Amino acid sequence: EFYGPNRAKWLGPYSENATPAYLTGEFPGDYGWDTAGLSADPETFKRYRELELIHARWAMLGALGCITPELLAKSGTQFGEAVWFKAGAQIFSEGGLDYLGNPSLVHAQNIVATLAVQVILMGLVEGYRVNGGPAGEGLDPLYPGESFDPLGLADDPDTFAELKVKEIKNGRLAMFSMFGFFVQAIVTGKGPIQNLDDHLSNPTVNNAFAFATKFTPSA
Amino acid sequence: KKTIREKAGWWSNGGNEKLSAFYGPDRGLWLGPLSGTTPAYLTGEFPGDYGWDSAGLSADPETFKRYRELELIHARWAMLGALGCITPELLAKNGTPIVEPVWFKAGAQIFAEGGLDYLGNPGLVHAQSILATLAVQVILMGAIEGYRVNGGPAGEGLDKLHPGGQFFDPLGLAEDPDAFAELKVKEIKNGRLAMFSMFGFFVQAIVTGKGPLANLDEHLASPFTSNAFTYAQKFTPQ
Amino acid sequence: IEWYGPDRPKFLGPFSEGDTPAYLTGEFPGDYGWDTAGLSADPETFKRYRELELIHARWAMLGALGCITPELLAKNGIPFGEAVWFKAGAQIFAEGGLNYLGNENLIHAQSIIATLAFQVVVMGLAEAYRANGGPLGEGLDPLHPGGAFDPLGLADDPDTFAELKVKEIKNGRLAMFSMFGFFVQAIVTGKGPIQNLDDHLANPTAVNAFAYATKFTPSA
Ligand code: CHL
Numbered sequence: 001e002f003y004g005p006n007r008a009k010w011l012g013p014y015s016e017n018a019t020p021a022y023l024t025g026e027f028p029g030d031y032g033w034d035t036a037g038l039s040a041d042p043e044t045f046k047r048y049r050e051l052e053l054i055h056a057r058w059a060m061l062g063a064l065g066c067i068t069p070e071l072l073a074k075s076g077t078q079f080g081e082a083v084w085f086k087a088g089a090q091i092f093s094e095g096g097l098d099y100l101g102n103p104s105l106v107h108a109q110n111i112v113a114t115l116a117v118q119v120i121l122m123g124l125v126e127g128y129r130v131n132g133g134p135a136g137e138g139l140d141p142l143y144p145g146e147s148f149d150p151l152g153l154a155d156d157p158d159t160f161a162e163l164k165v166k167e168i169k170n171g172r173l174a175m176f177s178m179f180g181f182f183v184q185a186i187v188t189g190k191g192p193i194q195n196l197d198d199h200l201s202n203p204t205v206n207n208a209f210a211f212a213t214k215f216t217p218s219a
Numbered sequence: 220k221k222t223i224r225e226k227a228g229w230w231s232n233g234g235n236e237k238l239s240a241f242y243g244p245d246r247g248l249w250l251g252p253l254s255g256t257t258p259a260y261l262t263g264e265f266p267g268d269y270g271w272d273s274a275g276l277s278a279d280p281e282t283f284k285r286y287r288e289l290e291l292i293h294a295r296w297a298m299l300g301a302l303g304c305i306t307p308e309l310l311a312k313n314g315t316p317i318v319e320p321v322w323f324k325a326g327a328q329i330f331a332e333g334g335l336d337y338l339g340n341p342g343l344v345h346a347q348s349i350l351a352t353l354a355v356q357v358i359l360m361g362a363i364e365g366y367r368v369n370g371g372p373a374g375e376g377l378d379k380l381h382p383g384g385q386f387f388d389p390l391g392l393a394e395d396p397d398a399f400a401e402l403k404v405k406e407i408k409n410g411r412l413a414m415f416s417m418f419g420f421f422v423q424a425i426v427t428g429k430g431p432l433a434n435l436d437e438h439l440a441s442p443f444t445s446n447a448f449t450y451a452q453k454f455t456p457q
Numbered sequence: 458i459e460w461y462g463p464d465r466p467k468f469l470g471p472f473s474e475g476d477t478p479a480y481l482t483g484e485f486p487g488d489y490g491w492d493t494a495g496l497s498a499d500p501e502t503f504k505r506y507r508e509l510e511l512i513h514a515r516w517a518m519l520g521a522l523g524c525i526t527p528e529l530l531a532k533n534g535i536p537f538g539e540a541v542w543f544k545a546g547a548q549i550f551a552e553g554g555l556n557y558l559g560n561e562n563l564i565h566a567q568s569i570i571a572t573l574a575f576q577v578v579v580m581g582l583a584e585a586y587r588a589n590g591g592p593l594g595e596g597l598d599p600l601h602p603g604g605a606f607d608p609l610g611l612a613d614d615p616d617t618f619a620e621l622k623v624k625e626i627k628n629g630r631l632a633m634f635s636m637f638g639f640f641v642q643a644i645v646t647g648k649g650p651i652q653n654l655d656d657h658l659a660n661p662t663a664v665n666a667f668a669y670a671t672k673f674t675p676s677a
């Protein structure tokens with residue numbers, strides 16, 4: 001499974017004609033879901049694959065960077081502001097942005113200098129993604145290797161393709177989780193592990209349907 | 220090899236490398252030297268080709284020419300907007316009595332007592348009803364925007380984006396081939412700048428609620444306290 | 458009127474002869490020549506987009522019906538608690554629950570989880586049979602099956618089947634546009650669209666949309 005014409009598909013047993021003919025099983029996670037036909041052209045398919053994997057890895061990094069201060073708030077370090085949709089306000093505090101609640105570790109003051117250093121590093125490392133650099137030169141722009149794999153888990157090509165489909169499946173689940181974090185931050189106003197604590201406190205009232213009313217206009 | 224006055228560009232007759240940096244494969248790109256693989260369909264024969272189709276929406280050439288049309292029309296509309304958003308505020312800071320010179324509250328001027336004074340003057344436009352204004356707008360704009368796609372009284376078989384006949388190039392700036400090809404990429408770069416600035420006008424009106432020239436004065440007075448980050452706490456979900 | 462071929466009724470009329478796409482011939486129902494955005498250049502994107510348009514159309518038709526017939530039907534008789542459509546989901550949380558005709562002896566719907574779970578389970582196989590296969594037919598036209606969906610059989614002659622297709626897509630595009638209108642004129646008024654209709658019919662000059670134009674201006 002997971003590659004070829006007899007692979008795992010998005011409808012499963014009901015997925016023998018709805019899958020498009022141009023989604024042949026060579027690329028990872030090709031579950032055959034192009035119901036709007038946007039990746040019919042091969043250049044659109046390649047660019048959307050690049051966008052999907054980069055969005056995937058940014059989403060899983062964002063998922064861990066959002067939930068790990070919540071798990072450490074469960075663990076016991078207070079934080080400048082554990083809540084991820086209130087985490088940017090640590091640099092607006094009086095003590096600044098302490099990293100692990102440690103005032104002698106980051107202690108950031110200027111949000112403008114943080115954005116300047118952030119864009120000066122990120123523009124360089126995002127432009128290095130396109131056309132090689134100190135890490136690589138002319139590799140696969142989605143799977144470079146040889147400088148970002150110090151352990152090098154890409155040795156056997158069958159296990160490499162297995163890790164590819166595992167990565168893209170964890171990535172679709174990660175963008176799913178980050179979209180959930182986005183639309184349950186705005187309707188609840190509490191952190192996501194805190195929403196897990198509400199849903200584990202009473203599972204039948206602390207749902208999305210407790211807050212399913214608040215977005216009516218009402219003049 | 221080359222003397223000092225040629226490096227400054229004194230002589231505008233021997234400039235043939237002027238279109239070499241905006242057309243052809245040896246042109247400037249979007250990430251500069253950090254953009255190696257230019258998309259193979261963006262060959263640089265069109266104005267504004269910085270090799271940027273990262274989402275890949277313009278791989279097909281028919282979709283690409285429709286997107287070029289949409290880009291130039293949005294560019295000219297946002298250019299007219301970004302000129303027509305700040306100039307009521309500029310003339311209010313001049314001293315011309317425009318009563319609500321911010322662009323995001325100028326539509327509500329027609330619900331006032333005295334209607335819509337144009338330059339703050341009842342001798343001007345003095346339009347009262349929004350209904351007849353929108354009616355003559357949809358009639359005039361239907362006629363004009365329907366003349367746009369398949370021709371009309373100001374040109375029939377001309378180009379759909381650059382007609383340039385006796386009505387849309389009356390001053391005659393685009394008679395020369397190289398001057399027209401240079402002012403095409405000048406037009407689309409000024410239009411992309413004004414599209415970005417109109418998006419900035421939209422987001423600045425949404426999250427601040429003040430004037431864009433008021434935003435410019437509140438950034439000129441305090442740059443480090445009154446940045447975009449002091450309004451970053453305005454959409455916190457409670 | 459022809460609705461097919463090169464001389465079809467187009468979306469700009471006289472202004473539609475230079476705009477008209479070369480990939481958009483007089484084949485499919487409702488082709489007024491409107492692809493100014495350029496999103497139907499390759500025919501399988503056009504196939505998925507025609508499928509998307511017809512499914513959105515056939516959903517928005519019943520959406521407009523389920524919008525206005527509670528409000529109109531409450532205007533005639535049969536009173537409800539929350540008769541408007543966009544508070545209609547809140548009747549689950551009522552002390553008497555959502556009822557179909559309002560009377561207490563029909564359904565007694567207090568749970569939102571059971572209804573959502575049941576409709577997800579049945580529409581999984583329903584929309585999966587819509588995608589492909591199914592007991593009512595597998596290899597038919599996926600947009601226009603017929604067979605076990607036509608008890609009356611109005612698709613007999615290809616001419617009346619074609620004109621039924623074009624009036625289907627025209628009623629559906631009207632329903633999608635009007636459902637967009639329902640969506641936006643719910644949120645700018647907070648009041649029902651039939652009640653918006655009586656508010657417009659009471660004062661056409663000053664109880665139109667432009668009375669709610671200064672509503673969405675940002676503060677501070
Ligand atoms: C056999 C039954 C079966 C069916 C019917 C489906 C179909 C589905 N699979 Mg699935 N699969 C099935 C089995 C299997 N799948 C997979 C592998 C996968 C993968 C990898 C993926 C899927 C995904 C999906 C979903 C894609 C369609 C969609 O996005 O929903 C469209 C319909 C809705 C969203 C309706 C939602 C229900 C409800 C009405 C919502 C409530 C509405 C709100 C109240 C309205 C909002 C209000 C306002 C404010 C906006 C859908 C649930 C994809 C997915 O998860 O996307 C989300 C996906 O990535 N499947 C395997 C392994 C081989 C299966 C095994 O048999």
Ligand code: CHL
Nearest residue numbers: 118119122123124127246247248249250251252253269411
């Ligand atoms: C070599 C360095 C170099 C770098 C790093 C860039 C960078 C860029 N150029 Mg380029 N250029 C570079 C060289 C050159 N450019 C140009 C000429 C142009 C033009 C004409 C254009 C560009 C554009 C771009 C952008 C295209 C990608 C994009 O849209 O990012 C978008 C993503 C980001 C910028 C990152 C996101 C911002 C922020 C850091 C994170 C979010 C912060 C918030 C706090 C988040 C909170 C929000 C919440 C609420 C959701 C990108 C910023 C285009 C542009 O301006 O697009 C905007 C464009 O039109 N360049 C020339 C002349 C030939 C160059 C010569 O070397």
Ligand code: CHL
Nearest residue numbers: 356357360361362365466467468469470471472489491630
């Ligand atoms: C010859 C004159 C003629 C004119 C002017 C039009 C006009 C139009 N027809 Mg057409 N038609 C015409 C002939 C005919 N039409 C049709 C049958 C159809 C159909 C079936 C359809 C059209 C549609 C259209 C529209 C397509 C272009 C567009 O999207 O506008 C874009 C520009 C606008 C919409 C601007 C107008 C709105 C307003 C002035 C601006 C609103 C400003 C807001 C305050 C800003 C919003 C606030 C922000 C914050 C959100 C356009 C409005 C399509 C349509 O209805 O799309 C909606 C459509 O489906 N026509 C027939 C029968 C064969 C014709 C016969 O000659």
Ligand code: CLA
Nearest residue numbers: 353354634635638641642646653654656657664665666669
């Ligand atoms: C075709 C279906 C349809 C119908 C029957 C109506 C009917 C109505 N709408 Mg709805 N509306 C529709 C589509 C529709 N609209 C669409 C597609 C949109 C999205 C742009 C809206 C957005 C909208 C808002 C935001 C509001 C209304 C309101 C209203 C009511 C007053 C009319 C008004 O203010 O004009 C609004 C009309 C539009 C924005 C465009 C509708 C398209 C029409 C059919 C084309 C114009 C033809 C017209 C007769 C000639 C105008 C001449 C001149 C003024 C230009 C009225 C009951 C208002 C209300 O609730 O009143 C109390 C209100 O607040 N509507």
Ligand SMILES: CC1=C[C@H](O)CC(C)(C)[C@H]1/C=C/C(C)=C/C=C/C(C)=C/C=C/C=C(C)/C=C/C=C(C)/C=C/C1=C(C)C[C@H](O)CC1(C)C
Nearest residue numbers: 271272273274275296297300303304322325414415417418
């Ligand atoms: C390139 C690329 C590439 C890759 O690959 C992909 C992607 C990313 C997708 C792409 C991108 C894209 C983009 C960026 C877009 C954007 C756009 C815009 C911003 C526009 C504006 C736009 C804008 C606009 C139109 C504007 C306009 C304006 C107007 C009309 C006017 C207005 C006005 C005025 C005068 C003032 C008064 O009081 C009123 C009003 C009326 C208000």
Ligand SMILES: CC1=C[C@H](O)CC(C)(C)[C@H]1/C=C/C(C)=C/C=C/C(C)=C/C=C/C=C(C)/C=C/C=C(C)/C=C/C1=C(C)C[C@H](O)CC1(C)C
Nearest residue numbers: 491492493494513516517519520523524542545633636637
């Ligand atoms: C053509 C063209 C051309 C060129 O290309 C350009 C462009 C522009 C791109 C294009 C256009 C497009 C468009 C116009 C689109 C639109 C759409 C829509 C609006 C839809 C709606 C749509 C809409 C819809 C679906 C709706 C639906 C609904 C439903 C189902 C449901 C409903 C309901 C009911 C029953 C009742 C309850 O109590 C509530 C509810 C639940 C609510």
